[PDB]
Design a binder for this molecule. Structure first.
Ligand code: MG
Ligand code: MG
Ligand code: MG
Ligand code: MG
Ligand code: MG
Ligand code: MG
Ligand code: MG
Ligand code: MG
Lengths: 388, 388, 388, 388
């Protein structure tokens, strides 16, 4: 039969965080997989999946939009956030299982591919080497290291890199992430210290990158509109591919964009057309970042179509393990209005052990695989060799 | 291989109009079919398809969104209307061929089904018996016939019927379709004659229908906002499932809806999220009618998702041959936010000859088939036995 | 010291659902309590609280807005929903502990009381007797029972009752809750069956209530704007205190209200001023329902002030155990712009065992207690006598 | 009589495309002509005209707005695009025939002329010499050729030239037209390569043009708002007469204009006041380009009046054969709010064979002819000497 027989979750060590997986098995023995995350502000996703998966057992593996519709009904009052992340993770395992059942790559379920390769940017560059040097080396501890990291990206034929906010001139190099309470300074004001350190960091990065490697700047939720404007004025003459600002104020973000000489990207934390809509109605973004790991890829196709009608291109949010990269590769293959795809090029020493296949890059582009499903499977024995 | 080898068009007599078909053949010998129309104000669709199909030969049958994206590029300046109808017809033949290649019904490509049966309304009731009595009988020529037709719908367990505008008290019964120049009276004013004949007709229909069969009223493009308001005021105390008004004025239609005591439906003539958007932004509709035959079903899924975010349910436009009904059945199977499905229950005497399978209704609902593809194929020998 | 030493969660059987509690202990041995829920579409709240509570240990019990600010930072990306419910539950335990530390009732932290008694409505009336007759009797199985339940409310001096949607004429009496997939009919259409059963039910309720007991109607998320309008038209001549409609479409809900002859209430599922704002900007509500159990009472005071500036009165969402009632009583005591307070008068046979104090009603009003903290404590031994 | 007796279509080779013509004959033997196009994304126009022309036979040649009104009715559902192009082509042949019947130039039907000469810009300069060197020479293959072409325009007393997007530094010189799938890169992203090649091309053009010849830049549909902004920022210090951007997003185009230091033109692909209106309401354009060949000149007068009330000047879209130039010359003669007129100065070697009269330019202006009708007639024998 095509019934779902079981929905299980798994977790393994990823150094400074864990990876999580959904494992869905059908009556025929097909196994669909997804990867999800709890580290990025999302405690409780596993608990959601465990409850929702119980309702799925006995249903058709083929009927993923039925599952979505029922799940949305069952959790309507507390929809969004971690509930919606659980639903998305299950969706992504359903899609894998369905594609495997039909012996096709997942992009074959998504309209077919319309490109073979996807341009990427090397994300958390040099953020991972600065923040998690125990896992991603060589460690970066000063402006010369920042420069060398951009040189390495250039040498390795990557066409774009993304950094965050770093303080260089007040002790050991450290990230500035007050929006996530590191440090706890909840007003999120921007001062001369933030501005001059942003400038110093970005100048070093540009010096290493050369003029032909693009630089993206992610500000996450680390200011208010007032402070974002201050940052954009400071950096008015810099060449930036985008400045990324997460906000729950469509009006405030739109004000910021209207005064920006740089492209503004946002939306990586939002769910469904409903949450994206106020931003598009307000002209708040140049680029919409879609987290397909959170939303589910089928739901993400809906969001992509919605963006397309507003002539907005989309970029996947992708900063997890190899399975997330392959999930996003399939989305990226099928979406016409694709800006670029995020990926982390800094990998854990045991990353390749955890998965059957690793993503392949050539000349700054990700090669889209053609195996049934997403293109890689977590390896159960290897997961258990890396307890969280 | 999975290459498209040929794209052909066919045409046959349908009494007072013709049916048209796209026939797409793959290198493996799989044949995908769609049905399209030129009679509903759409001269030139065949010519579009013939040009676009030439570009498709040699491409992958699996890559339908690639074809769509390329076709949109190639025809961008004159997009919409008959160009977009040609693109939609090809899309629908691509989907059939893809589903057949994967040995699944077309709804398996659309998210899977989430219902097995679809409530319908019996459309052009008694419009077809009044306007085309040579083909659909018994002929209706007076108010007693109108009543009897609604009684027949009731007896046959249909839960809803749709009529149009008819003049009963000025000679032989005849339709009032000034928006389509029958008669040519281009101001489209509404007067006492129109209003009293609408009332007389609908009262007869209600008398026959009983209180539990729902009545839909289609006004097409037959007035201006002024006249639609006059009609809604006249019929303020009638129980109507919807009043259907086509308009290229989102502001005017929204004004009409705001003053309507009945649900308003519209949009059957529109293409893509872009054309629907101004109506939804204006709160112009209770129900959005989506013509999936015109748009292509894949594009129609995008429109349905967009409507869903606005909490608007959708209904397919379906008033052609059996293949169009089966196309729409697959769309209807997969869309959560489904209002109801249109179908014509009055059929040509040779309709079943033209197709391998006929739609099946039970207790006022359409049964969704489970054969690979749409669920029915045109029959080439039978097409040629009915030259247009 | 005033440090938090521990944050624990507890759970007990509540018949057809469970109750959940946060237990927070200070270095001085003061215990603060809250009650939270996972049954109303909210799997995962316990998991959130368990993670967040670990961060709270060692912090000052007095610094609740510091905890809130830090928690919001830590979970910013997946804020709202179950994450925000966990934060609210912890807030409410912090407030209890703070008030106990200062030897005052919780309303003393909220601006002081400005009334001594709170008018209530008897909620889920007769919903609980129809849906959960094993726990709340006497069972209601027909229209005569509906009438008798309203008579009982009248006799017992309650001034208002709230019901939901019930189907009486298609087999055994049963609720109509398609928005929560009972039944699974995800389009949420409204038909003659829904409308005539709403009318029959409400007429029976009114017959029992007399003209001086007010009737509230809760539609939850059980239609689309189209269907809500159909319901409001059907019930246009009924005297209703409010019609309650949950929606994630401020534009659609505002359209519905603009065409309503009844007061419209909404918002019970929303978090923070940010989520309420689009509804108020759109003139979408007469009354804003605030779930203080979900939001935290301190955050709910902010929302109440925001509503006050829009001249909108607020009502607590209160349909859980006695501790939730006492939490809401303290909020209700301090808010000037208070519409009314929800409470369930149907109680479990073991409810009073679970808590130290029970709410007291007189002449249709809740008496606001004056004990330190919320006014009642869960009893640990009794919780364990009722395993979930 | 003044009846239309026949409506015929003709087609001839125009090198890399064909020309098409409508030939309308009256009972008195007067022949009215128009020219139309299928190459610019418009397959099917001939088929539309063939159907509509059948309805016209027997009607008065004088009653062109009657024909328009009836045609709009008959094709209302699929209006716009290729249907509307067919209607426009017939309109333009009706106007020619009417003017010839009354022995006046066509501008005498349009309010009379209010100027004798029309300033032009030399369009597709050097686009035609780069893209179609087999037909328009001398071939342009490098930046020096670009410069020399602008020098030639200067020498020949043209006051303005228009170019498109060209890639010079990646192999043989080639156009960048992703919006029309040359190349197929459907996201339409703009990168450093596009930007530096735009700059290099335009700098060469300016070097040749001198400071007193104006340069127009046409971007067609080749980016999204994000990319148009990137282009405008790159070219912020260039002196451009206009930057032309086609868009189906009035909101997105308006955003772009609001951030442009150059005049923005658009609308060449739009039909009727209805399609122009959302752009004008949004302040999306400095200049409205009106395609009178597509719309019909009578309809184009309506659009011009509408633009006039918004204080927007209009420019004809004119890049076809001599008859299109003469059609547009008559429109340009009568419209007060005229920005400038497009024309191609690069002509096919056989162009003058195809028509009775050629347009005359003096000192950068087109001389408006004073012969009955448009001012030139296609020559039937010459059409047949150039089979398509
Ligand atoms: Mg980010
Ligand atoms: Mg979020
Ligand atoms: Mg219709
Ligand atoms: Mg249309
Ligand atoms: Mg409620
Ligand atoms: Mg909610
Ligand atoms: Mg142009
Ligand atoms: Mg167009």
């Amino acid at each position: 039969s095509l019934k779902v027989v079981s929905v299980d979750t798994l977790c393994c060590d990823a150094g400074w965080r864990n990876y999580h997986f959904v494992k869905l098995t059908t009556d025929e023995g097909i196994v669909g997989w997804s990867e999800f995350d709890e580290g990025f502000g999302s405690p409780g996703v596993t608990a959601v999946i465990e409850q929702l998966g119980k309702r799925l057992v006995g249903a058709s593996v083929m009927e993923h939009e039925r599952f979505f519709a029922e799940a949305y009904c069952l959790t309507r009052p507390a929809t969004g956030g971690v509930v919606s992340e659980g639903i998305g993770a299950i969706e992504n395992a359903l899609l894998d299982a369905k594609a495997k059942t039909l012996n096709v790559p997942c992009y074959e379920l998504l309209g077919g591919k319309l490109r073979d390769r996807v341009p990427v940017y090397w994300s958390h560059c040099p953020t991972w080497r600065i923040n998690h040097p125990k896992f991603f080396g060589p460690p970066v501890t000063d402006l010369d290291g920042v420069k060398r990291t951009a040189e390495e990206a250039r040498e390795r034929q990557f066409r774009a890199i993304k950094t965050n906010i770093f303080i260089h001139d007040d002790g050991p190099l450290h990230a500035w992430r007050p929006g996530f309470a590191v440090p706890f300074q909840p007003a999120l004001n921007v001062d001369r210290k933030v501005l001059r350190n942003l400038r110093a960091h970005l100048e070093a990065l540009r010096d290493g990158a050369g003029p032909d490697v693009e630089i993206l700047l992610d500000l996450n939720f680390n200011a208010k509109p007032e402070g974002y404007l201050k940052i954009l004025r400071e950096l008015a003459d810099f060449d930036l591919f985008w400045v990324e600002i997460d906000s729950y104020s469509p009006q405030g973000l739109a004000y910021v964009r209207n005064h920006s000489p740089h492209p503004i990207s946002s939306c990586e934390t939002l769910f469904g057309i409903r949450e994206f809509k106020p931003f598009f109605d307000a002209n708040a973004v140049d680029v919409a970042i879609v987290d397909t790991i959170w939303n589910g890829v089928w739901q993400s196709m809906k969001i992509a179509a919605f963006a397309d009608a507003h002539d907005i291109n989309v970029a996947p949010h992708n900063f997890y393990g190899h399975l997330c990269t392959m999930i996003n590769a399939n989305f990226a293959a099928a979406v016409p209005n694709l800006r670029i795809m995020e990926t982390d090029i800094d990998r854990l020493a045991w990353e390749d052990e955890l998965f059957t296949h690793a993503p392949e890059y050539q000349n700054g582009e990700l090669i889209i695989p053609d195996r049934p499903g997403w293109g890689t499977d977590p390896v159960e024995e290897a997961i258990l060799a890396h307890p969280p």
